[PDB]
Amino acid sequence: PNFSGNWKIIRSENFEELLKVLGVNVMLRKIAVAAASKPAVEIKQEGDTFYIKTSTTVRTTEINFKVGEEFEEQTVDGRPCKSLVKWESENKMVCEQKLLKGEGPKTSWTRELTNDGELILTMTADDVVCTKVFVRE
Ligand SMILES: CC1=C(/C=C/C(C)=C/C=C/C(C)=C/C(=O)O)C(C)(C)CCC1
Ligand code: NA
C-alpha cells in the first residue's frame, strides 16, 4: 500500500462521543470538534516506515513509526502512551496503545486504504468508535 499523501477530510462520525468516553468536558469538546472539522493530514510512507502529521488550529501531532516497533505518542485527548502498529491486513494498519501513567479507556486507532482510493481512520475508546474518511487533496 501507498498511504503517502496530503489528505482532505470528507466524512467524520462520532468524534464528540469519542471525546466524551475519554472524559473531555463540554466546552473543551466544542473547541476540539470545531477545530477537528477541517484538519490537514500529511503522510509520508517508505516501506513500513511512516510519518504522519495531523494539524488543526488547536492541536497538531507528528508521529514517526515503523510497523512492528513500539513507539511513543499521545492519545487523542493528549495522554502519553506507548503504541504498536501492525498490519491487520495488506491495506490496514492497527495501533494498540497503553498509557504511560495511570488508568483510562482502552484506546486504539486504525488506518486503511480502501479500494476506491480513500483513507479510513478509526479511533476507539472502549466501545466507542470514531470514523473519519479522507481523499488526497
Ligand atoms: C480533545 C482535546 C483538544 C483537542 C484535540 C483535537 C483537536 C484532536 C484532534 C484529533 C484529530 C484531528 C485526529 C485525527 O483526525 O487524526 C483540545 C486541544 C481542545 C484540548 C482538550 C482535549
Ligand atoms: Na504489505
Distance between Cα 59 and ligand 2 center (Å): 31
In CATH, the architecture of 1-137 is Beta Barrel (2.40)
Which strands, in side-by-side order, build the sheet including 80-89? Answer: 60-66, 49-55, 40-46, 5-13, 128-136, 119-125, 107-113, 92-99, 80-89, 71-74
User: Is 44 in contact with 32 (CB distance < 8 Å)?
Assistant: no
Does the beta carbon of 76 lie inside 6 Å of ligand 1?
Answer: yes
- Separation of alpha carbons 127 and 107, rounded Å: 9
Atom of ligand 1 nearest to the CA of 54: 16
Which residue's alpha carbon is nearest to atom 11 within ligand 1?
Answer: 36
1 CA distance to ligand 2 middle (Å): 6
Experimental method: X-ray
Question: What cell was used for 90?
Answer: 495488506
What is the sign of the dihedral through the CA atoms of 17, 36, 28 and 51? positive
Give me the helices (H) in 1-137, please: 15-21, 26-36
Resolution at which this structure was determined, Å: 1.7
Ligand 1 neighbourhood includes 19 CB (under 6 angstroms):
yes
